Coordinates of C-alpha atoms and ligand atoms in Angstrom, one line a residue:
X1 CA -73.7 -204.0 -147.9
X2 CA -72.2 -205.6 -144.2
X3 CA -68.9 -205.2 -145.6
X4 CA -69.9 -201.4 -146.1
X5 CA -71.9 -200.6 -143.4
X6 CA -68.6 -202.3 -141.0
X7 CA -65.9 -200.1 -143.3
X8 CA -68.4 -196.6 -142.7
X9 CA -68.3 -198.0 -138.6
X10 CA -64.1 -197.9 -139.4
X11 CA -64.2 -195.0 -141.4
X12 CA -65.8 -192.6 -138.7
X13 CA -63.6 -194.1 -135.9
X14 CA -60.7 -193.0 -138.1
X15 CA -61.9 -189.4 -138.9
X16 CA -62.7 -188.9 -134.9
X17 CA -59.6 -190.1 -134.0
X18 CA -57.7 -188.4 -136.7
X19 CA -59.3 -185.3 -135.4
X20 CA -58.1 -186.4 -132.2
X21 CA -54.3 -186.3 -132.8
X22 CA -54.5 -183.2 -134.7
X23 CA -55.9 -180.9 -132.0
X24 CA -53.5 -182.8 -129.5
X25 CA -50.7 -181.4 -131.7
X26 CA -52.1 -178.1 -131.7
X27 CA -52.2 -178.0 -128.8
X28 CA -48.6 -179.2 -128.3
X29 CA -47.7 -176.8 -130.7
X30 CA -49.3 -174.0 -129.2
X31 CA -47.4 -174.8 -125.7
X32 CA -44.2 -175.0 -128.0
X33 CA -44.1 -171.7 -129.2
X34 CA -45.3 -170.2 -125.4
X35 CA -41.8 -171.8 -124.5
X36 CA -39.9 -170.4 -127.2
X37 CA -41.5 -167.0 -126.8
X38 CA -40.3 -167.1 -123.0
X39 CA -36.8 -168.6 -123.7
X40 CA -36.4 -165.8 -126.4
X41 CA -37.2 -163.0 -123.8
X42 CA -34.9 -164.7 -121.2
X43 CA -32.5 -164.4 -123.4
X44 CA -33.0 -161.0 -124.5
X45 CA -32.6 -160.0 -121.4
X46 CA -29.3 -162.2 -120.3
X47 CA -27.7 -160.6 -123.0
X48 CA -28.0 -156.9 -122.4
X49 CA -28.3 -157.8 -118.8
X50 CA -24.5 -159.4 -119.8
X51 CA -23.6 -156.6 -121.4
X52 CA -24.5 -154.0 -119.0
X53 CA -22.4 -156.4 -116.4
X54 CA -19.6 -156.5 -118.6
X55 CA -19.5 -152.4 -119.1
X56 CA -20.2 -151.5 -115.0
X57 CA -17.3 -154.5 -114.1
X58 CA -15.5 -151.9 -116.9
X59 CA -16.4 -148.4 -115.2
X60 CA -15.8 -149.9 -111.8
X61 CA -12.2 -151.4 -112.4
X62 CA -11.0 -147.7 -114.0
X63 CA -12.8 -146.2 -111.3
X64 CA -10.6 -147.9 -109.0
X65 CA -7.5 -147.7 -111.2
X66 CA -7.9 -143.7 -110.7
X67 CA -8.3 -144.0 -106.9
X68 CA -5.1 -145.9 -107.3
X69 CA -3.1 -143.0 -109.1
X70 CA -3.9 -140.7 -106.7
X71 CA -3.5 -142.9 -103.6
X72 CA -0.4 -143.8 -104.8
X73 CA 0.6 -139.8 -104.9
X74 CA -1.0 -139.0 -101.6
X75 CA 0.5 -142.3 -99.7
X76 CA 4.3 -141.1 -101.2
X77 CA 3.9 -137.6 -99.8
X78 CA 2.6 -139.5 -96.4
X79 CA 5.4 -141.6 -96.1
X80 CA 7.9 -139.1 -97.0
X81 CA 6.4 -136.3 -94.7
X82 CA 6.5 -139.0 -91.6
X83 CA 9.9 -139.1 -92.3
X84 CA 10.8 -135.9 -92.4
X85 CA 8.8 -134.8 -89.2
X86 CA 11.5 -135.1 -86.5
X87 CA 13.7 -133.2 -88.7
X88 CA 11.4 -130.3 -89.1
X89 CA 10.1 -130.6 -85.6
X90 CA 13.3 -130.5 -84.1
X91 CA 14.6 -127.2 -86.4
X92 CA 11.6 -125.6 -84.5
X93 CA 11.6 -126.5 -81.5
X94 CA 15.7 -125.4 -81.5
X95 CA 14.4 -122.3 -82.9
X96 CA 11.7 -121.7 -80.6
X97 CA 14.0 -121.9 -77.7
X98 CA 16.5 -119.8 -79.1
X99 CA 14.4 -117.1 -79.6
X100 CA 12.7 -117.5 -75.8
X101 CA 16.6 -116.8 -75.0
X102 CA 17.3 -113.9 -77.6
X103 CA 14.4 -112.8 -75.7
X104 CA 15.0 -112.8 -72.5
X105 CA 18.7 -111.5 -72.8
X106 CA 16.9 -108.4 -74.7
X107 CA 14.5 -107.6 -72.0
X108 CA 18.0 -106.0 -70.0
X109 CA 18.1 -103.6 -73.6
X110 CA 14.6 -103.0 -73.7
X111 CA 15.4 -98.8 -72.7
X112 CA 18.7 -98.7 -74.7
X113 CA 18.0 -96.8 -78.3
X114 CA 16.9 -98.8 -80.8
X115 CA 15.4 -101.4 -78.8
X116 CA 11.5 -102.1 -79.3
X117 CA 10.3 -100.8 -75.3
X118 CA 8.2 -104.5 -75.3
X119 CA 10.8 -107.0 -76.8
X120 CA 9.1 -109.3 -78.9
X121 CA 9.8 -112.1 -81.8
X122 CA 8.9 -110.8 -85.4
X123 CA 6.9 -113.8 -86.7
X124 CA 6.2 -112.0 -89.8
X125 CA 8.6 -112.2 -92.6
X126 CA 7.8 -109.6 -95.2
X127 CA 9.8 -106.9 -96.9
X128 CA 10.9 -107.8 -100.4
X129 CA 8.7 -109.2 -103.1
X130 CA 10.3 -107.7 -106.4
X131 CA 8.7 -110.9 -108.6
X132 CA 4.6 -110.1 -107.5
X133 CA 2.0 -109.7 -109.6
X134 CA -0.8 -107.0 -108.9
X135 CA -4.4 -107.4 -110.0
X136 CA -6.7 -104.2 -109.1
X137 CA -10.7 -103.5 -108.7
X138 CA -11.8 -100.2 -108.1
X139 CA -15.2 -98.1 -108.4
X140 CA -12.7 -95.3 -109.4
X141 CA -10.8 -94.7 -113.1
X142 CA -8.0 -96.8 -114.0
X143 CA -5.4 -94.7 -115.8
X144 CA -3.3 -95.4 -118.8
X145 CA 0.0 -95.8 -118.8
X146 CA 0.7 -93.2 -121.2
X147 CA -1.6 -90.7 -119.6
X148 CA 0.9 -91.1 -116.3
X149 CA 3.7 -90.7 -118.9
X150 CA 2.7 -87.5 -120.6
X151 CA 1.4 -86.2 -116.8
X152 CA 5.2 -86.7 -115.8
X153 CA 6.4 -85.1 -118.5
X154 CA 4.1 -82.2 -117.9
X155 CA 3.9 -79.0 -115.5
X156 CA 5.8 -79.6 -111.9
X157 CA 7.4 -82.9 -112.6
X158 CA 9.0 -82.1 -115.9
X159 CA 12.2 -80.5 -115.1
X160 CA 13.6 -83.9 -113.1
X161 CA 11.4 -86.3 -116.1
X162 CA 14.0 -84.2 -118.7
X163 CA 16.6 -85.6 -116.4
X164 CA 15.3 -89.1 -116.8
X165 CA 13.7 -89.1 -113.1
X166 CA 10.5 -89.7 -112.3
X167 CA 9.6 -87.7 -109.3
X168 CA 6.4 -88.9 -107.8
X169 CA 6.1 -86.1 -104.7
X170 CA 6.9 -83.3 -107.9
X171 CA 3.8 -85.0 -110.3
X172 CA 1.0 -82.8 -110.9
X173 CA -2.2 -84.7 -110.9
X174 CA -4.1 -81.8 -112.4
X175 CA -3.3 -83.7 -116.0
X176 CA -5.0 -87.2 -115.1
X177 CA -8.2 -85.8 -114.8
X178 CA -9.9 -86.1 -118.1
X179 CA -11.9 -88.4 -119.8
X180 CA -9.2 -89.2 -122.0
X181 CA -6.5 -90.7 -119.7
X182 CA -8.8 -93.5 -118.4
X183 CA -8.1 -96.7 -119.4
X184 CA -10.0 -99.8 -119.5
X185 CA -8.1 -101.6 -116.9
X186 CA -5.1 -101.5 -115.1
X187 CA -1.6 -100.7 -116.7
X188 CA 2.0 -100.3 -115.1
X189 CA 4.0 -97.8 -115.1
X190 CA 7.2 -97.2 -113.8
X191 CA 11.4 -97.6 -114.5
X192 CA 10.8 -100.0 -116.5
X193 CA 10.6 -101.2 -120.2
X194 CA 11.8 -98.1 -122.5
X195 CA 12.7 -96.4 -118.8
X196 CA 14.6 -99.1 -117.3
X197 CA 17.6 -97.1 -116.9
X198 CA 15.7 -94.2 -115.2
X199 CA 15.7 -93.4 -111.5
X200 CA 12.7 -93.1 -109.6
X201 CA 11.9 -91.1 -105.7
X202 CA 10.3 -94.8 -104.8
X203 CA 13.8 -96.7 -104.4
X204 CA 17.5 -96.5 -105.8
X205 CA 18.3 -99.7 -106.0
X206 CA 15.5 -101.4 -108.0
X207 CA 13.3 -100.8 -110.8
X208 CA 9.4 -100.4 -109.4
X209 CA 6.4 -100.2 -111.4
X210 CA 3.1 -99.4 -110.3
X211 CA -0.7 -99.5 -111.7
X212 CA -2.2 -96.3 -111.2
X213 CA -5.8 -95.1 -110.4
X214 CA -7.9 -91.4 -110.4
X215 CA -10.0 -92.0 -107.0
X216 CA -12.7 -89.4 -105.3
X217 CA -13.0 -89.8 -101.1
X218 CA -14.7 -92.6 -99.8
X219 CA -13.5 -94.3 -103.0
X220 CA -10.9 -97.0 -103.4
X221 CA -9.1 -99.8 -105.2
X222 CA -8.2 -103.4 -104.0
X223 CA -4.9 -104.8 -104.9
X224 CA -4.8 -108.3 -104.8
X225 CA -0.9 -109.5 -105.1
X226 CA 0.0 -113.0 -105.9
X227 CA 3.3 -114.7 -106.7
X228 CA 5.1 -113.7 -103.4
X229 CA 8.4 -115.9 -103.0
X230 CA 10.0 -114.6 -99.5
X231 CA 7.3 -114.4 -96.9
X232 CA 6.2 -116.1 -94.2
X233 CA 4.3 -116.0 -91.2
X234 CA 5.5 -118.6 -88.3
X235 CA 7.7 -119.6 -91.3
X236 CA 4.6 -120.8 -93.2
X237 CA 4.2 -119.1 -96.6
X238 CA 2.5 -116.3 -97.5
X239 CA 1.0 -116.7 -100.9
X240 CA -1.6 -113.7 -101.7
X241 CA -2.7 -110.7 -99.9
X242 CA -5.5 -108.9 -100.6
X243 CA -5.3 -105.0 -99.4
X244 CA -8.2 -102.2 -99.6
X245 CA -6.9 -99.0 -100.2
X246 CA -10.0 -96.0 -99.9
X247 CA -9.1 -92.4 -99.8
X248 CA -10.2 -91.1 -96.5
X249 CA -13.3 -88.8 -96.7
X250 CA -12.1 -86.1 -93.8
X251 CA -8.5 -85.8 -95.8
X252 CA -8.6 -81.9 -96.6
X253 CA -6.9 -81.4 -99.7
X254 CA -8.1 -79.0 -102.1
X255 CA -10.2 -80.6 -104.7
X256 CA -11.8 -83.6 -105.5
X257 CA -9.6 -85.9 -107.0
X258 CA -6.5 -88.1 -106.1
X259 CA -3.8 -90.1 -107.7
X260 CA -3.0 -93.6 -106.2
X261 CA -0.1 -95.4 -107.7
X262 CA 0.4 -98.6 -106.4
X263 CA 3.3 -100.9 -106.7
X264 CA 3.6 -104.2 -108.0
X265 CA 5.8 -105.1 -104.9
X266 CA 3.2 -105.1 -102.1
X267 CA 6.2 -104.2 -99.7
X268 CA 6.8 -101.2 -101.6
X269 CA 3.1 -99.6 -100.5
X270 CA 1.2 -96.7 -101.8
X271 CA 2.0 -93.4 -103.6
X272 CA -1.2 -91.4 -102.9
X273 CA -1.5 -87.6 -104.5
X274 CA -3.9 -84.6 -104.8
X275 CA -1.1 -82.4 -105.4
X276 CA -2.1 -79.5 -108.0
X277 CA 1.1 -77.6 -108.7
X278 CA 0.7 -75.7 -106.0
X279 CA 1.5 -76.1 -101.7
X280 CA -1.9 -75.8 -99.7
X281 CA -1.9 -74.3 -96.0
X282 CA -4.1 -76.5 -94.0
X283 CA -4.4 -79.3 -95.9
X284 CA -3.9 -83.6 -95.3
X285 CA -4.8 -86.6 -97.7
X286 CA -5.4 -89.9 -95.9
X287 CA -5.6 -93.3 -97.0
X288 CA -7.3 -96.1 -95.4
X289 CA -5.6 -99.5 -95.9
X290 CA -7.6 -103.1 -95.1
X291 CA -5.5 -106.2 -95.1
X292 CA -5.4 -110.1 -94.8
X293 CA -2.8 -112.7 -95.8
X294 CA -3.2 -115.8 -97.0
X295 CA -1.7 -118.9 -96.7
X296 CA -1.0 -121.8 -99.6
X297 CA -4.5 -123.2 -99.3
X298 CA -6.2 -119.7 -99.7
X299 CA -7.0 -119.3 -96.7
X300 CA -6.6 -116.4 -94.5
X301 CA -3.7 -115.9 -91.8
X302 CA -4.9 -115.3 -88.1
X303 CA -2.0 -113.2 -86.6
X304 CA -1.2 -113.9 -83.0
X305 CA 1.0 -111.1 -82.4
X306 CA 2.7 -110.2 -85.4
X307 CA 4.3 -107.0 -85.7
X308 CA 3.6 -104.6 -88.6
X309 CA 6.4 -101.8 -89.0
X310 CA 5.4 -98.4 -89.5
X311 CA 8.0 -96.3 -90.6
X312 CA 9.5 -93.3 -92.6
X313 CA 6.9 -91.3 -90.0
X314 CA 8.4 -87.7 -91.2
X315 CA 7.6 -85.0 -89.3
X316 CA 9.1 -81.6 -90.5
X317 CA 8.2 -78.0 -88.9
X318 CA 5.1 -77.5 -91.1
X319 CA 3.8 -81.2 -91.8
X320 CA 3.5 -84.6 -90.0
X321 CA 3.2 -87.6 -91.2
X322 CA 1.3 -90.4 -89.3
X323 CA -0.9 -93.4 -88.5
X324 CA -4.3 -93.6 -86.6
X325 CA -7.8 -95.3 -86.7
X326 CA -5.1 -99.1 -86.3
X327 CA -5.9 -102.1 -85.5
X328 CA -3.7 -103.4 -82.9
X329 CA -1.2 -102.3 -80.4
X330 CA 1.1 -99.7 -81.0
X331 CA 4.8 -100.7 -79.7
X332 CA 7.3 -97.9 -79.3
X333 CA 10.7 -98.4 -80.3
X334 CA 13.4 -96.5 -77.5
X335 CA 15.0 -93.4 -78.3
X336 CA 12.7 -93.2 -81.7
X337 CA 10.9 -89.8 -82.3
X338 CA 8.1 -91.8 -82.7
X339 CA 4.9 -92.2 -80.3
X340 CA 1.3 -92.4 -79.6
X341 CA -0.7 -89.6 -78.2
X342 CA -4.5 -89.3 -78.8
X343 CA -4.8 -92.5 -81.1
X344 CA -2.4 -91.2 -83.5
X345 CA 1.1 -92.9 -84.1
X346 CA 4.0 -89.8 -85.2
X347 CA 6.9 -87.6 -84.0
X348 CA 4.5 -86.2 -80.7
X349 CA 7.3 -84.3 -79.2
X350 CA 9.8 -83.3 -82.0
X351 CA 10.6 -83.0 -85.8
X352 CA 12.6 -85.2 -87.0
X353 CA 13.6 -83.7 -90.3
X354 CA 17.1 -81.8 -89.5
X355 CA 19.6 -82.4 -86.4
X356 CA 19.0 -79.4 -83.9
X357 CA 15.7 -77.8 -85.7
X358 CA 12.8 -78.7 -83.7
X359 CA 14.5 -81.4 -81.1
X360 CA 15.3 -83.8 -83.7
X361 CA 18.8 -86.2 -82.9
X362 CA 19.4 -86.9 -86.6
X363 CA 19.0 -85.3 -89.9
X364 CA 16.5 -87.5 -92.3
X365 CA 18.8 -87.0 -95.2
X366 CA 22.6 -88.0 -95.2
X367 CA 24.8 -84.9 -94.9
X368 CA 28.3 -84.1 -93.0
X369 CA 26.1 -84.8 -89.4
X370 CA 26.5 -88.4 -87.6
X371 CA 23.8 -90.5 -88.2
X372 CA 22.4 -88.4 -91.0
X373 CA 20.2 -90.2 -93.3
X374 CA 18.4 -91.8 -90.7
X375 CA 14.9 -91.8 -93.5
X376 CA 16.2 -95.0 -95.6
X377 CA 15.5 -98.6 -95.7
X378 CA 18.9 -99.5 -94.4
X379 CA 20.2 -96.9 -92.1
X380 CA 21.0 -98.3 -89.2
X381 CA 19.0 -95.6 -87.0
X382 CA 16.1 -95.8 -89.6
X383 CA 14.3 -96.9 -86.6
X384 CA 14.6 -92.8 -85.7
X385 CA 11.3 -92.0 -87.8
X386 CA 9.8 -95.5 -87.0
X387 CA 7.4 -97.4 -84.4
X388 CA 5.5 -101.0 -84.7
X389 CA 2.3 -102.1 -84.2
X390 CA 1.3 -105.7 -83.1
X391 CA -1.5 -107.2 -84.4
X392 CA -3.8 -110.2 -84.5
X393 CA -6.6 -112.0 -86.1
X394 CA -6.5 -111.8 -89.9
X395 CA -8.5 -108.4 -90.7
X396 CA -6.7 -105.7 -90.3
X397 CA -6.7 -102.3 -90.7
X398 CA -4.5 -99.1 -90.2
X399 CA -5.2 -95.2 -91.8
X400 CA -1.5 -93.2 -93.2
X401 CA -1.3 -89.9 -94.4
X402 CA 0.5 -86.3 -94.1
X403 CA -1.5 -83.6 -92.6
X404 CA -0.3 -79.9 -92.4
X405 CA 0.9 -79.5 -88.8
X406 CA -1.7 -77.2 -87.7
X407 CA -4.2 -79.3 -88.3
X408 CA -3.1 -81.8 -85.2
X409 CA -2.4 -78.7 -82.3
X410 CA -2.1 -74.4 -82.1
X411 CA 0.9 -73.1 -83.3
X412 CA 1.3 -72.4 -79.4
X413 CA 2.2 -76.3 -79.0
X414 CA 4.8 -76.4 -81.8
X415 CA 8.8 -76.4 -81.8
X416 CA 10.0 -73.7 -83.2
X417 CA 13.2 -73.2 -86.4
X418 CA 14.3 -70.6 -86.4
X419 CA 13.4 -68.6 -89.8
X420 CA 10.7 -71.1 -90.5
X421 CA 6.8 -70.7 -90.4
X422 CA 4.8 -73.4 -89.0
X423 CA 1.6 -72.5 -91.2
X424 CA 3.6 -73.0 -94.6
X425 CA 1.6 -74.6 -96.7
X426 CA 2.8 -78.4 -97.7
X427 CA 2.0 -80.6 -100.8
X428 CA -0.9 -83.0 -99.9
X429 CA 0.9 -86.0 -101.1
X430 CA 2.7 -89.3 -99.4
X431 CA 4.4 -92.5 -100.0
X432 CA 4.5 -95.0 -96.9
X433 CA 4.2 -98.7 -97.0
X434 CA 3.3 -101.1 -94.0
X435 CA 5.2 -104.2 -93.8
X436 CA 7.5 -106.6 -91.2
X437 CA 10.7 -105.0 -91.8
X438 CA 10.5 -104.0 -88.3
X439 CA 13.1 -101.0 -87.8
X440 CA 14.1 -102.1 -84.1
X441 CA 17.5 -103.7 -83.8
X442 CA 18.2 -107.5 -82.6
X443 CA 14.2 -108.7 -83.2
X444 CA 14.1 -112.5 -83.1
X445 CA 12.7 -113.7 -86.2
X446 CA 10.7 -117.3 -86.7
X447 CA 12.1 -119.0 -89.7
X448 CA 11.1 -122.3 -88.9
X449 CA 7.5 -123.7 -89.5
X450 CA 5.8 -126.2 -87.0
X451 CA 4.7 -129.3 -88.8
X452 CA 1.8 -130.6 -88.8
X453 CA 1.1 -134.7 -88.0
X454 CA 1.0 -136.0 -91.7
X455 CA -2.4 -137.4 -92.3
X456 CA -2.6 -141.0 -94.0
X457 CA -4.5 -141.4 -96.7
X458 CA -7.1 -144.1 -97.2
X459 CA -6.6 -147.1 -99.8
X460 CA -9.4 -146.9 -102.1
X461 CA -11.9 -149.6 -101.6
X462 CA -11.8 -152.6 -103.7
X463 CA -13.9 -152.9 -106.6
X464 CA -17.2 -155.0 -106.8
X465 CA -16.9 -157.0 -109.8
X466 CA -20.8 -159.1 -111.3
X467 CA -20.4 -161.9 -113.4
X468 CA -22.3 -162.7 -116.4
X469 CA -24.9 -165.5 -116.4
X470 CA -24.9 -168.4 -118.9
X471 CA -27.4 -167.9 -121.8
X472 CA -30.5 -170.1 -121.7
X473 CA -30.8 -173.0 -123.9
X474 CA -33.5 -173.2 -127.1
X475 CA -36.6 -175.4 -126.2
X476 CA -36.7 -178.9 -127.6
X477 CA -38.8 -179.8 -130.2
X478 CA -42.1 -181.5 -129.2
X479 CA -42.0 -184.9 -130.6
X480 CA -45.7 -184.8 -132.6
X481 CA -47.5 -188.7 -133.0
X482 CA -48.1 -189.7 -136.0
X483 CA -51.7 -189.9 -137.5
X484 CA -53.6 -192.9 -138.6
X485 CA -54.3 -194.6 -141.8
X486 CA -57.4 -194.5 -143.2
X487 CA -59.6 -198.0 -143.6
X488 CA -59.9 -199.7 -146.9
X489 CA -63.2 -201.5 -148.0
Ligands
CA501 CA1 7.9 -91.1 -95.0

C-alpha cells in the first residue's frame, strides 16, 4: 500500500507536468504559425512588389530610349542649323542691302512710266502655283463637272466649245440652274483630262481647271489651297491660303444666280458669271474676296507692307472694271491708266481698251499699234491696266467686279468714241485674280529668309531605376521539449 500511495504521489506529478509541456508547445506552436503567417504575407508582397519594380524600371528605360530617338533628331537639326546660320544670315543681310540700294537708285524713276509712284520692295512672292490643290465649302450648290460640260456646250458658248474652246465670258449660266446639275461636292473642270488639248479664255500657255459653284448674293464659297511650291513672303514659305469668296449683295445683275469657277491655281483667281445669253444695260456683279496666308507651321502670315497687284483693270467705253471696299493702301504705278478716286481703284480718267478711243495710250489686245497687247501677263506695259495695293496684318480683304459705266458717273462725265454708246449694255461677267506679280517694272524682290537663332534642345532626363529587395527567409522551426515518462510501481 506505501509503495502505491508513493507511485499515485509520482503518477500525478507526471500527469501535471505532462500537461505542462504540452500547453507550453501549443503555445510555441501557436507563435510558430503567427510567424509563418507574417513571413508568407511579407513575401507576398516582396514578390509582386519585385515584380512591379522590375516592369516600371522596364517602362522607364523605353521611356527614356524614346526621348533619345527624338533628342537625337532634334539635336542633329540643332547642330546643323548653327552651322548653317552665318551662311543664311549673311545671304540676307547682302540682300537686304542691295535692295535698300535698288531702292534708293529707283526713287530718281519714281515719275518715269512704269515705275510704282512710292518705290517699294515686293516681299511677296506669288504668281505661279500650277501643282495646288483646292478644297471648297460653301452654303451654295456645288456643280458637276458634267453639268459645266453640257452648259458649255449649250446656247452662247457653243459655237467656240465646237471649236474645242472653252469660252468662259461666252458661257451661259442659264443651264446650271436646276436641281439636276448639283453635285455632292466639288469637281474640276477645265483643259484637262479628255480636253487637254483644248484652249481656254483663262490662259494660253497652260492647262487650268477649276471647281465650280451656283451662288445667290450674300453667298459664298471658301477655297482653301494647299501644296503651293513657289511662294514666299520675306522668303519664308507660303504653304496654304485660305480665301472667301461671297458674291456682293449691291452687284446689279439681272437675276438671282451666279456662276463662280474657281481655279485650282490660287494665282489664277476667280471666274464669276450671271451672264444669261443676253447684254444687260445698267448692270455689275461683284465679288468680295477675304484672304490670309499661312506659313509652314499653319499659322497665319502678318504682312508688313506687302504689295498685292491688281491688274487687268479694263475699262472700255460702256463698262469698267475695278476694285473698292480694300484693305490697305492703294499705290499708283506712273503713266498707268489706273487710279483711285472715291475709294474705288480703275481707269478714272480714260479707257484703256483701244489706242486713241477714249484717251487710252495702248490698245488692250495686240494689233499693228506699238505697245498693243498691253492686257497680258507678260507684256511689258501690262502695267497700263494695272495698280498695287500694300497691305498688312494677315486679314485681308479687297471687293472686284465689272459694272456698266453709268453706274459709276452721268454720261456727261464720260469720254466719248466716236460711233459708240456709252449706255450699251455689257455682260455681267469677270475674271481677275489678286496676287504679287506686281506689274511695275524694276521692284526689288526679297528672296532671302532671315534665320531664326536655332533653339537647343534638351537631353532627356535620366531614368530613375528601383531595385528589387531580397525575399524574406522561412521561420525556423521551434525546437518542442520532449515529454516525460510515466512512473512505474
Ligand atoms: Ca481684266
Amino acid at each position: 500500500a506505501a509503495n502505491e500511495a508513493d507511485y499515485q504521489a509520482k503518477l500525478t506529478a507526471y500527469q501535471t507536468e505532462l500537461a505542462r509541456v504540452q500547453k507550453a508547445n501549443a503555445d510555441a506552436k501557436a507563435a510558430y504559425e503567427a510567424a509563418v503567417a507574417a513571413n508568407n504575407a511579407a513575401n507576398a508582397a516582396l514578390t509582386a512588389e519585385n515584380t512591379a519594380i522590375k516592369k516600371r524600371n522596364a517602362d522607364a528605360k523605353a521611356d527614356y530610349e524614346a526621348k533619345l530617338a527624338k533628342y537625337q533628331a532634334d539635336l542633329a537639326k540643332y547642330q546643323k542649323d548653327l552651322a548653317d546660320y552665318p551662311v543664311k544670315l549673311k545671304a540676307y543681310e547682302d540682300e537686304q542691302t542691295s535692295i535698300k540700294a535698288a531702292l534708293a537708285e529707283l526713287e530718281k524713276h519714281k515719275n518715269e512710266d512704269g515705275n510704282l509712284t512710292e518705290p517699294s520692295a515686293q516681299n511677296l512672292v506669288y504668281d505661279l502655283e500650277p501643282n495646288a490643290n483646292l478644297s471648297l465649302t460653301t452654303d451654295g450648290k456645288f456643280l458637276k463637272a458634267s453639268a459645266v460640260d453640257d452648259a458649255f456646250s449649250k446656247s452662247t458658248s457653243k459655237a467656240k466649245y465646237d471649236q474645242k474652246i472653252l469660252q468662259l465670258d461666252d458661257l451661259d449660266i442659264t443651264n446650271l440652274e436646276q436641281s439636276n446639275d448639283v453635285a455632292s461636292s466639288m469637281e474640276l473642270y477645265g483643259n484637262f483630262g479628255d480636253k487637254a488639248g483644248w484652249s481656254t479664255t483663262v490662259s494660253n500657255n497652260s492647262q487650268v481647271k477649276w471647281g465650280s459653284v451656283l451662288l445667290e448674293r450674300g453667298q459664298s464659297a471658301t477655297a482653301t489651297y494647299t501644296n503651293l511650291q513657289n511662294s514666299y513672303y520675306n522668303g519664308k514659305k507660303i504653304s496654304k491660303i485660305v480665301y472667301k469668296y461671297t458674291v456682293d449683295p449691291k452687284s446689279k445683275f439681272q437675276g438671282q444666280k451666279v456662276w463662280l469657277g474657281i481655279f485650282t491655281d490660287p494665282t489664277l483667281g476667280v471666274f464669276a458669271s450671271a451672264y444669261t445669253g443676253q447684254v444687260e444695260k445698267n448692270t455689275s456683279i461683284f465679288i468680295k474676296n477675304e484672304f490670309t496666308f499661312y506659313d509652314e507651321d499653319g499659322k497665319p502670315i502678318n504682312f508688313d507692307n506687302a504689295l498685292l497687284s491688281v491688274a487687268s483693270l479694263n475699262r472700255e467705253h460702256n463698262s469698267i472694271e475695278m476694285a473698292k471696299d480694300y484693305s490697305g493702301k492703294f499705290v499708283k504705278i506712273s503713266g498707268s491708266s489706273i487710279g483711285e478716286k472715291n475709294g474705288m481703284i480703275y481707269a478714272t480718267d480714260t479707257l484703256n481698251f483701244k489706242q486713241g478711243e477714249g484717251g487710252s495710250r495702248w490698245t488692250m489686245y495686240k494689233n499693228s499699234q506699238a505697245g498693243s497687247g498691253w492686257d497680258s501677263s507678260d507684256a511689258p506695259n501690262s502695267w497700263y491696266g494695272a495698280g498695287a495695293i500694300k497691305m498688312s496684318g494677315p486679314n485681308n480683304y479687297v471687293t472686284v467686279g465689272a459694272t456698266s459705266a453709268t453706274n459709276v458717273m452721268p454720261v456727261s462725265d464720260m469720254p466719248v468714241v466716236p460711233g459708240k454708246d456709252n449706255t450699251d449694255g455689257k455682260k455681267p461677267n469677270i475674271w481677275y485674280s489678286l496676287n504679287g506679280k506686281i506689274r511695275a517694272v524694276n521692284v526689288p524682290k526679297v528672296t532671302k529668309e532671315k534665320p531664326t537663332p536655332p533653339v537647343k534642345p534638351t537631353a532627356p532626363t535620366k531614368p530613375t531605376y528601383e531595385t528589387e529587395k531580397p525575399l524574406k527567409p522561412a521561420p525556423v522551426a521551434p525546437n518542442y521539449e520532449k515529454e516525460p515518462t510515466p512512473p512505474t510501481r
